[PDB]
Amino acid sequence: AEEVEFVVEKALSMFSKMNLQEIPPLVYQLLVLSSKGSRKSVLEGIIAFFSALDKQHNEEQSGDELLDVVTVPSGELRHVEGTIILHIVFAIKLDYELGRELVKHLKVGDSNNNLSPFSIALLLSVTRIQRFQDQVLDLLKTSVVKSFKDLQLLQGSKFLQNLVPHRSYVSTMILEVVKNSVHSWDHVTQGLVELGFILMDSYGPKKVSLSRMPNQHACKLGANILLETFKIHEMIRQEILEQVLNRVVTRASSPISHFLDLLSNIVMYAPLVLQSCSSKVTEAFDYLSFLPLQTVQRLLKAVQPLLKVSMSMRDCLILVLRKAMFANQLDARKSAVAGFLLLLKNFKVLGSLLSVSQVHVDVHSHYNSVANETFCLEIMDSLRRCLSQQADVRLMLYEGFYDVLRRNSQLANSVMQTLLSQLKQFYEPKPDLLPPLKLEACILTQKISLQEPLDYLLCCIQHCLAWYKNTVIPFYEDLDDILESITNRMIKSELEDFELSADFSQSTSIGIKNNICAFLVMGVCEVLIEYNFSISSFSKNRFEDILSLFMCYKKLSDILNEKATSDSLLSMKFVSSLLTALFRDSIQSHQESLSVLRSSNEFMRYAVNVALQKVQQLKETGHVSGPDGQNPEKIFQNLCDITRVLLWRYTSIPTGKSISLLCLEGLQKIFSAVQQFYQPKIQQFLRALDVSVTQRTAFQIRQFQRSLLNLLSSQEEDFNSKEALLLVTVLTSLSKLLEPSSPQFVQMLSWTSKICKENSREDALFCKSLMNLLFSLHVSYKSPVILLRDLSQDIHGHLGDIDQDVEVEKTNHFAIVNLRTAAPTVCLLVLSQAEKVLEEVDWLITKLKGQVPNQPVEKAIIMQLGTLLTFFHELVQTALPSGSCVDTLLKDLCKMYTTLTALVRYYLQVCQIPKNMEKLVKLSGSHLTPLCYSFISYVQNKSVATAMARVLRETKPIPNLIFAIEQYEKFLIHLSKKSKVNLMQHMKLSTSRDFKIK
Amino acid sequence: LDPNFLLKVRQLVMDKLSSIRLEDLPVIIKFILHSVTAMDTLEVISELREKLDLQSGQSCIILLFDVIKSAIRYEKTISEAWIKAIENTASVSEHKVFDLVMLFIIYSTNTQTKKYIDRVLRNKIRSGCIQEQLLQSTFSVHYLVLKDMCSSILSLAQSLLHSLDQSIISFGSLLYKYAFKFFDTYCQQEVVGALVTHICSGNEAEVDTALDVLLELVVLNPSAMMMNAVFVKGILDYLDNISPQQIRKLFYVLSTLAFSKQNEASSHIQDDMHLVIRKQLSSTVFKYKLIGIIGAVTMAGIMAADRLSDEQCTQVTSLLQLVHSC
Amino acid sequence: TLFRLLCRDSGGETESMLLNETVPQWVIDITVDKNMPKFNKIPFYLQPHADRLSASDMLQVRKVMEHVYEKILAEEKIELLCQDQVLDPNMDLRTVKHFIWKSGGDLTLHYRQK
Amino acid sequence: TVKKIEPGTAADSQQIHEEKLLYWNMAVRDFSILINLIKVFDSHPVLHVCLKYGRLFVEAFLKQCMPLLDFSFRKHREDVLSLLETFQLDTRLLHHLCGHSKIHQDTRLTQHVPLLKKTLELLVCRVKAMLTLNNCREAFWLGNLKNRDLQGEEIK
Question: Is the bond preceding residue A824 a cis peptide, omega within 30 degrees?
């Protein structure tokens, strides 16, 4: 036994000296020798040796393509590592115990420095043995998730960054395992694909914060693994697409947004898709009729890059869509309309260029534009036949006709005539009959439901007509005259002509009909407001028509609101254009006409509120409802234009809610929305407001800093709490852009610290937000343990002492901490921050414990725990309220003593005791442990099945702390025995309590 | 249409499921499975389990199961609701052949339900809900549908044999035995190849159980095993990781297979087994010489087994003289 | 034959659709994506005439001459040889390996003072 | 034996609860006699058994007897108080054994102290819960018991 170990160790040393091409023969023989003897030693030596080769090769490869010192070429290194892996996997097949040692040796929570590109690639091919498939893939899944938690924890804390040197992460290792797999690593691909889908299946979004980011990173890694494996390996790309389409083509309505993005990325390599995995796309097309409308629209958009270059896929889709439309079954014609819309919204050229014994013939006929027009008109005529269907189909067509008419300018006449014919069914041509719209024909009675979205029909007509007059000009006059007639008769209507307050009930039939008719009138008024703004340019007469239309819109809105919603029909481009003229227009001619609109404060509120809706839709859904609402470049341009107006109005003139306050709300929403979606365009976003990102952000930050000072300079009763809360939220979001290693960040932290130290507000919510901003800035700068200690003293001074015979001196470090906010606002906030400090220290101790730089880390750990001891020392003798403050402090003391136990257990492994560790032990025994017993006594002495659960739940915390202290003292006895220094001389005898009933 | 009206007419169709003919079952099942929503999937599937009895008969059943495969091909939640219906069942008599066939269908069709189907299958086997006679009846009367997915069954059988419970281990052995009996030649070779990999694995319990199945397959179907003798003979190259007790059993199944019949096919393996042992006895390694003694005595017992002509009697005599000399 | 056309006819409507269907990915990477192909390398270890290095195939001898010069104007003081034959400084290693090496092993270059 | 006793329900017979209270009194008396034997027999194997099974007796007490006292505290109040006072004398000796184990720093003994201390404190909190469910929370009251040796001499 020992002889086998000795000879194996000798051969391990010979690895370095001998040639690499002789390694695979040696490993195969060494694995056979391993069977009758040591198994872990052989595997450890091979893995460690090849990991060093990988690391050395990576360093020498990184650099210019000039003369490099290349000890091993990349081509032969991957070939050698590949055949070593196959030998190990084949050995595991005939030796089950060899496989168990490999999993045990590479078992992960710790970083597991043993993991490497070679060891990860070894595990992926081991999955070809079904006996090890699940546990190996589970080992890899836990490794990447834990690795991302390490990355998240390091990024958020400056204290850890100064201590922990950067180490490679499992996510990076696996990505280059895929990259290295191009050297004929076909045995790794099978387990590579399964690992990618496990990451996506287990950590995909479940929309149906601490863990969401590592889950999102883990899910994104699976998409990267699958996408890169698709490009390189041809024998596996067919399986990848089939599994992706399986997850996407379903009626389950599960969140599949991440799978749809992977499908879109895969189909960007259309020749790769068409070559091998071509039938799967067509089979998914066959199931489009059975799928729901929302799935069809998202699936067809995902495979749009494939249909853009390929005619066969486009031709097959047209055949499926034509068959689905002719099908008598419903919910399939809706998908056919959606499919035909998407094809006609995106492609100007539609069309092409069997039985057992029937074959296709390659006819060499030149492309015919005239035949293409008839092909498009045939689909356009079919879509016109779908305008008499349910209101769901009508809504889709009205949204699609604008993009269809912009794409195919040759379909403009067909679309416009179709829109005109539909409008004639609901328009009264009589010059004096009121109302001009038949709102009773839009209602289908069989239960009352909406049949025709008349408001959406005019929105499509107005936008299509607007495109017509500025794209093809350089029936249209008939449409221009109808809209003017509609506008005049809607204004002169007295709201009684629409049969509208009569019932407005949410249950009765007449109330449902009245409620729907109320929405249509408001929707029509919005569209006519948009129409009259553009037509006749800036004329006073037309703007008076807009104001008259708005009053009709607002009066009906007030009636529905008080007796009690829907999206606005204004395009985001118009809202941006309306706001700019309504607030930032100084042209002499326009001022006369704009004074009509500006005089109505309710109109001012309406214009800003609709802009807030557009931003809110972007945050919720990722796109805006109106025209061009799914174009990221045009949404961003409107975001910049709206932001400029909102910035100007708020700052130039200070202060339902006021207009300036509403602009502040829109600014906060935009800043959050821009960072969430247009992350790479932040420099362009900040540029368009009127140096680098940090310099421009600091200019805006200082601009909002002055605003907050003005409210704080006001009186306590006059304090505008709503505005101050918004300013801190804006400052918090903007401060995410500053670089922490910059003077601009230091100024932001210094300003926040000064505001907290000097301003005393009675608003608990304002204090909580301000402290959260201060702690967010501070943690990325340095350890907040000194900040935490000073805040605990303020809570002690304001709330007094539990002794009731001593007087605690009021430090007054921070004025924001007053008698009202000291608890439960500040106390709960500082306890949550000390929790994060302990999690950081617990992470360090775990790394050191598995590691065996130690002396610098050990001193910093003791320094953190030493300062955090004084923070807890102040809180354990404070007369906290009996609510969640006591519950959280008791739970946090248990975490403090658990962390102390982990530090002591670390020295048990290392000390075969330094002064700093001894002084920490002495401090814990003189300033925390005796006072913990006093606090426990203080808490207990002073004072259906739901109550039964509550009383039994309250019996948990105090015994949990008692176990934590006794567990801590148990291991200090072990350390004193092992290190021969008595650490229990600093600890007094434990104090026990007994119950006695009066 | 009205949602409640659709449920009412669906219930009327479901009510007479027992009294309808056989040809209209595929379309009726197709209508019920397609006309479901998210919240009623659990109940409609549960109702379908107890209502469907299944008791041109083969063709209609094949078309019935073909529709179900197409109906659940793109619907994962329906498959999950079916396993939940099976798991909730707590009585042995309620489990039926159709219940077991559907479990294999979901296993072969949807790859995302492999782990859930496995975990419930262990529980039912341990509790006795799924039993040998139910498995025997399933294969006996519905081996037409099961044949199209023999690899799916074998993957389940191979995984079941890796367990540590004798009840689960015995069921996995039966899943091997029934697959060999009721499937075609190609899926039979996969069964033998799967057993050979079990013996050459390294786990003691796995090796002895696979050798028990190999002996059983030889006894029931010697003719089918005679065509697989090349793969069974390949185990002789991996005697280093095999205990002497398992070596004796391995030589027993090899010898009883070679002498099971007297056709020309058996004469080739009969003389081939003689050659392997004649060179293990003469090997320079002492370990292989001891293996040759075990195998030669094992074979001589089956040649001389009483049920033998003079030429047969001198062959066992010749082999014994060889071992005594070596 | 998947598709046949003249060079000047690729801009046509019918030819462009046919080209999208037939042109393979390995041509798309270079003509459409504008990616650059791999750069092959030969590993050669210098040995003093009486340290493995990998470089571009079109690297000239002069570059290997100056690398040795910094290790120990460069052209005039250092001469390189392979298989006991002097090497043209303007010649590249790709030509050296194919013509003068005449062996199945990795290229070996010997550096000796002029 | 203690683990097998069930607290029953508040709807059971009145005399049934009385016999369970008497049965629990006998179990505590046997516990008192057994635990008190460590004063004279104070070897490591004896203390280890008392430290380990003393915790298990308290664990079974607050899992079985404590729910029983919730049902019957109003009608039976002197019995419940007397039972708690008698058991409190046993738990006090358990605390002194815990302190004795830590003072002598016996590693085999101190590895039972943390879980015994948790359960001993869990009993004090569980008594408060019983009073709270019986609207007698203000009657609950703690005090720091003196640290004593195994014999009973005060440690100060």
Answer: yes
Distance of CA D3 to the CA centre of its chain: 14
Question: CB atoms < 10 A from the CB of A588, how many?
Answer: 6
> Comparing C-alpha atoms, which of C63, C64, C61, C2 is closest to residue C27?
C2
CA-angle at A112, arms to B201 and A182, nearest 5°: 70
Picking from A963, A970, A995, the nearest residue to D110 by CB comes out as A970
The experimental technique used to determine this model is cryo-EM
Measured in angstroms, the CA of A367 and the nearest CA of chain C are apart by 5
User: Which residues have C-beta within 8 Å of that of residue C81, sequence separation ≥ 6?
Assistant: C49, C87, C109, C110, C112
**Residue D52 burial by Cβ neighbours in a 10 Å radius (0-12, 13-18, 19+):** middle
- Alpha-carbon distance of A581 to A641, in angstroms, equals 11
Nearest Cα residue in chain A from B2: A447
Q: Does A695 touch chain B (CB under 8 A)?
A: no
Question: Which of A943, A963, A974 has its CB closest to that of D137?
Answer: A943
> How far is the CA of B247 from the CAs of A489, B244, B325, in angstroms?
101, 5, 22
Write out the H or E segment, with its range, that includes residue D144.
strand D142-145
A830 closest CA partner among A770, A876, A787: A787
Rg (CA), chain C: 22
Between chains, do C43 and A366 touch, taking CB under 8 Å as contact? no
Residue A642's Cβ-count burial label (10 Å; 0-12, 13-18, 19+) is: buried
Residues 84-123, chain A, touching B (beta carbon < 8 A): 93-97
Q: Which long-range contacts (CB under 8 A, 24 or more apart) does A243-248 make?
A: A243/A193, A243/A197, A243/B111, A245/A280, A245/A281, A245/A283, A245/A284, A246/B74, A246/B112, A247/A201, A248/A284, A248/A295, A248/A299, A248/A302
CA nearest to A282, candidates A303, A268, A305, A261: A303
**Are A95 and B202 in contact (CB < 8 Å)?**
yes
- b vs e for A170-187, b when ≥16 Cβ sit within 10 Å of the residue's Cβ? bbebbbbbbebbeeebeb
Q: How far is CA A570 from the centre of its chain?
A: 28
Amino acid at A451: Q
Min Cα separation A672/chain D (Å): 48
Is omega for the bond preceding A429 within 30 degrees of 0, making it cis? Answer: no
CA distance A770 to B325: 98
Beta strands C108-113 and C41-48, pairing class: parallel
- Report yes or no: C40 and C57 within 8 Å, Cβ to Cβ: yes
**CB contact B275 to A (< 8 Å):** no
Work out the angle at residue D144's Cα, subtended by the Cα atoms of residues D138 and D146, and round it to the nearest 5 degrees.
145
Q: Which residues of B16-41 are buried (b: 16+ CB within 10 A; e: fewer)?
A: ebeeeeeeebbebbeebbeebeeeeb
d(C-alpha A792, C-alpha A813), whole Å: 10
Measured CA to CA, the distance from residue A226 to residue A244 in angstroms comes to 10
Query: CA nearest A454: which of A534, A352, A569?
Result: A569
- Entry resolution in angstroms? 2.8
Those residues whose C-beta lies under 8 Å from the C-beta of residue A125, and which sit 6 or more positions away, are A85, A86, A89, A185, A187, A188, A190, A191
Look at the block and give the residue holding tokens 């090890």: A132
> SS in 3 state form for A743-755?
HHHHHHHHHHHHH
| B79/B76 Cα distance (integer angstroms) | 5
Judged by CB atoms closer than 8 Å, whether chains meet at A995 and D142 is answered as yes
Closest Cα in chain A, distance from residue C22 (Å): 8
**Among the partner residues D103, D117, D142, nearest to A940 by beta-carbon distance:** D142
Nearest to A515 by CA among A556, A568, A458, A455: A556
Q: What is the CA radius of gyration of chain B?
A: 25
A268 in reach of chain C (CB within 8 A): no
Chain A positions touching D103 (Cβ under 8 A) are 989
Structure tokens at A305: 């890059």
> Cβ distance A530 to A462 under 8 Å?
yes
